[PDB]
């Protein structure tokens, strides 16, 4: 597994998939706004008022669709070379250290019958 050291914790270093878009929106809940705003400082490609339109365009489904396609907004900029590395700097601003590893599915016993 290709992984990097962040905040003293291992994290798989790859582009976020459809699993990550869904698990993100389901796990941040209210923090969807905060991660978005923190990702503006870390990734200038997302520093536009994207969040202002995303909140209204996806208000139809709520926090779920709002955050589901916010995660695609980074993958749209590159997606081959964009990886969780940039997303983790947004979670670091809100002390979301456990969420940054839970996002990729690291909440599991890595092979322990669940």
């Amino acid at each position: 597994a290709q992984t990097f050291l962040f905040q003293g914790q291992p994290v798989v270093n790859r582009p976020l998939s459809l699993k990550d878009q869904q698990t993100f929106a389901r796990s941040v809940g209210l923090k969807w706004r905060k991660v978005g705003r923190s990702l503006q400082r870390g990734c200038r490609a997302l520093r536009d008022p994207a969040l202002d339109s995303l909140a209204y365009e996806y208000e139809r489904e709520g926090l779920y669709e709002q955050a589901f396609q916010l995660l695609r907004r980074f993958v749209q900029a590159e997606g081959r070379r964009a990886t969780l590395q940039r997303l983790v700097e947004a979670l670091e601003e809100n002390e979301l250290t456990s969420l940054a590893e839970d996002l990729l599915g690291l909440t599991d016993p890595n092979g322990g019958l669940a």
Binding site: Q2, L5, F6, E78, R81, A82, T83, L87
Partner: protein, 98 residues
């Protein structure tokens, strides 16, 4: 020179590792490295065509035999970026998980 190791000789997946490791860090090392390598200002501005401009510097430096680890390390040391040197040295190592 005083060692052996071409950065251009590394596999595409290892270059991705560098291009990712700095990606969630302070203002990309490519800006400091370009000035030390003597890269022209217009070449730096042509490499902003992609959202990861660091990959464009690392890739376009790898087109020439000047892309030695010994020359890369010397430039990283001049810009006080030994932090990245250590992080890469910790990936350029052997393992046996199976």
């Amino acid at each position: 020179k005083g060692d052996g190791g071409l950065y251009s000789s590394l596999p595409p997946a290892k270059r991705e590792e560098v291009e990712k490791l700095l990606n969630g860090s302070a203002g990309d090392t490519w800006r400091h490295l370009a000035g030390e390598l003597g890269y022209q200002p217009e070449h730096i501005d042509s490499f902003t065509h992609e959202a990861c401009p660091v990959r464009a510097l690392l890739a376009s430096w790898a087109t020439q035999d000047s892309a030695t680890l010994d020359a890369l390390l010397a430039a990283l040391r001049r810009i006080q970026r030994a932090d990245l040197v250590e992080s890469l040295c910790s990936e350029s190592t052997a393992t046996s998980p199976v």
